[PDB]
Design an enzyme around this catalytic site. Sequence first.
Site, mmCIF file in Angstrom:
data_model
loop_
_atom_site.group_PDB
_atom_site.id
_atom_site.type_symbol
_atom_site.label_atom_id
_atom_site.label_comp_id
_atom_site.label_asym_id
_atom_site.label_seq_id
_atom_site.Cartn_x
_atom_site.Cartn_y
_atom_site.Cartn_z
ATOM 1 N N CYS A 119 3.638 2.626 8.881
ATOM 2 C CA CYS A 119 2.435 3.423 8.525
ATOM 3 C C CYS A 119 1.303 2.469 8.124
ATOM 4 C CB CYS A 119 2.741 4.384 7.390
ATOM 5 S SG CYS A 119 1.428 5.616 7.172
ATOM 6 N N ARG B 276 4.745 5.287 3.071
ATOM 7 C CA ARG B 276 4.335 6.414 3.948
ATOM 8 C C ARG B 276 5.153 6.468 5.253
ATOM 9 N NH1 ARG B 276 -0.204 8.179 1.273
ATOM 10 N NH2 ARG B 276 -1.389 6.552 0.184
#
Lengths: 299, 292
Positions: free
Chosen positions: A246, A251
């Site tokens: 990410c 994330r």
Amino acid sequence: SVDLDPSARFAEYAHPERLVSTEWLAAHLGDEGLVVVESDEDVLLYETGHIPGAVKVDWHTDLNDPVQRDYIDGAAFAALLGERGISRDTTVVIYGDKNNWWAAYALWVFTLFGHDDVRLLDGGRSKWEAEGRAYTTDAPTVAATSYPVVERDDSRIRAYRDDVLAHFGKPLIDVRSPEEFSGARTTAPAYPEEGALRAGHIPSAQNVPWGKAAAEDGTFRTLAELDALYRDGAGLKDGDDVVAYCRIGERSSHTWFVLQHLLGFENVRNYDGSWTEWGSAVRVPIVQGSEPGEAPAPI
Amino acid sequence: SVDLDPSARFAEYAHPERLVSTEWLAAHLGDEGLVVVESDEDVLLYETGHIPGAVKVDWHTDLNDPVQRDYIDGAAFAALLGERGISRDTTVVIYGDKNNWWAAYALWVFTLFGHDDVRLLDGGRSKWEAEGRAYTTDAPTVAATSYPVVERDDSRIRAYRDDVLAHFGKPLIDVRSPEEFSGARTEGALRAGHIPSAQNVPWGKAAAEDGTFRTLAELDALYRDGAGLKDGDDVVAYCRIGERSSHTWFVLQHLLGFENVRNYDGSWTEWGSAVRVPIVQGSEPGEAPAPI
């Protein structure tokens, strides 16, 4: 000791022991050998109301080395879990905001430390709330435990920049938005420390925005839907050594979870350095546009 | 051929051939074999007024790979210099804003391509203007020349991340502000601090009020006494980007005459976002960890 959730809904997944339902959890609250952990992007939610007896992990203060770009060590992990009444054999159930985005991230960190029984509450805060289930602001009031100091394992579920550079010709999943993927944006205005001086993606990365794996109610999508997304959509095959990234490792943990525990790929690593590292690194291959692009030679 | 400036001020430096005075340039302007290049952090200054005959290099468009984090390659460099009427044998005098901060950077890039005769105009734009000397706002009509395609040499004056990781035990100069060196600021990163064992010498300390390089005495106090550099030391300089640490590279290589000086161009923008690289805080250098 703490049983598995035998709900039919989970039995189609590779590792159904990695999920529990809101109904199962409501029936198990306060049970010996169970600790419930809230893990959110927005850390202030816990104080607005949490599943009764739940403790909190704060990604700003609890899980990162305070000086170096790295996750905590075995000594910091042991003190964190002991304070929270967690022993080595404890069943940990983690839940969170934004469809268990940060919940998966906490599970990934627990897995670096080899904690065996760690599960997600499917649907997180959002399904708990839609079902009108109770929150408290009472403290867990927790009796401390001793958790052993274990050495963190970065071999199995973690990739560094050199593994990524070496990985070209092997599947690469970029979980950022299409705008980020193409090079139109780098970050959020809420997280300026997560931009970079270059925009684009890693050449040959398939874009699968992480949120595609979550249904509207925040539960993990069915095996058929996930299979559509990652096997038909992104071209993943059995035996594939997969790397997900990410802007930061926090994330891309949800997609690691999806591929490791729901689709059952044996070799799935989170490249935690992600676009913040890659986009600021000197002489790393970058492409722009919505095209994945040609894999370069392994560097 | 283009004569060296014999000025006494420069003759005490290791490489007096790397500097020219404003007085020398005024007397030598328009001489055959001399091209003057303006290189500014603020690229728009050139159109407000430039030394007559001077061409421009624009760090936003002319010197970086458009896609990768890297400098241009030999084919791009030859095209850039050809367009500006620069030949392999040309004497190039570089000047610009902020005490030749970016002029030093341009000279660094020219040296990666092994251009022999590159010099800084001591005191740059500020000392030229302060002396009341002529500017034109004409762009200076130029006949293109052929410049050879040479391979860029990253070995001698450039350092990569893994060079720095391997460098602990040898000297690092951090040329950022005290409040960046401590880690109460950050072209930022997500982490704040400095490379453990790095001596803070903010780059402007090597420049006088008038924009010129300080005396050998003053530099010796700064870099030898202040920062503990010794003869035969292998030195790496870094800032937030390589553009901003080129001035201190120039000071150490050309004025103090350290044989081994490298610009770590990745600098804090890479270091401060790299996974698992050593970082320390406060005004203290810190101790060297083992080479990684």
